[PDB]
């Protein structure tokens, strides 16, 4: 037999494609939100030059509430990204590669 290599090839292919779909989906979501926050930031700067009513005050509170909501989602994403970098299973690559390369040295 060839060990688990026959089973490993389609699993790595499944992992490669699913990781690629996840990256592109997350990358697009962050960029699309960043585009709208930059557009909102530019609009709020133009309004700051205007010499406001109660509706402006209410919408200012809605802007502040949205900032909290987005900041919470982004801060927790940064924490999870930091955790994946320090993850135990994610750090096993270098340990497997060292054993993999040393065995392939004996081949050639």
Structure tokens at 25: 């989906």
Work out how many domains the chain is built from and give that number. Answer: 1
Q: Which domain holds residue 100?
A: 1-108
In the numeric block, the tokens 């940064």 are attached to: 78
Where does the chain break, by residue before each gap (C–N > 2.5 Å)? 51
Q: How was this structure determined?
A: X-ray
Angle between helices 5-48 and 54-85 (to 10 degrees): 150
How many angstroms is the resolution?
Answer: 2.0
- Could you tell me if 70 and 37 are in contact, meaning their C-beta atoms sit under 8 angstroms apart? yes
Sequential DSSP letters for the chain: --TTHHHHHHHHHHHHHHHHHHHHHHHHHHHHHHHHHHHHHHHHHHHHT----HHHHHHHHHHHHHHHHHHHHHHHHHHHHHHHHT-TTTTHHHHHHHHHHHHHHHH-
Instruction: Tell which residue, 41, 29, 40, has the closest CA to residue 77.
Output: 29
Dist. CA 15–CA 12, nearest whole Å: 5
CB 48 within 8 A of CB 54: no
Cα–Cα distance for residue pair 31/87, rounded to 1 Å: 26
Question: Is the Cα torsion angle 19, 23, 26, 28 positive or negative in sign?
Answer: negative
* 23, 34, 71, 72, 103 from 96: Cα distances, Å: 24, 38, 37, 36, 11
| DSSP letter (8 states) at residue 2 | -
CB contact set of 47 (below 8 Å; sequence gap of 6+) = 56
Q: Which residues contact 84 (CB under 8 A, 6 or more apart)?
A: 90
């Amino acid at each position: 037999a060839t060990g688990a290599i026959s089973n490993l090839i389609p699993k790595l292919g499944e992992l490669l494609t699913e990781e690629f779909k996840l990256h592109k989906g997350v990358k697009k979501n962050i960029e699309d939100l960043g585009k709208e926050l930059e557009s909102m930031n530019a609009a709020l700067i133009k309004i700051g030059e205007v010499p406001l009513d109660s509706q402006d005050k209410l919408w200012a509170d809605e802007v502040r509430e949205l900032s909290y909501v987005i900041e919470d989602v982004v801060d927790k994403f940064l924490v999870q990204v930091d955790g994946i970098k320090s993850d135990d299973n994610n750090n096993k690559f270098k340990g497997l590669m060292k054993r993999t390369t040393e065995l392939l040295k004996k081949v050639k």
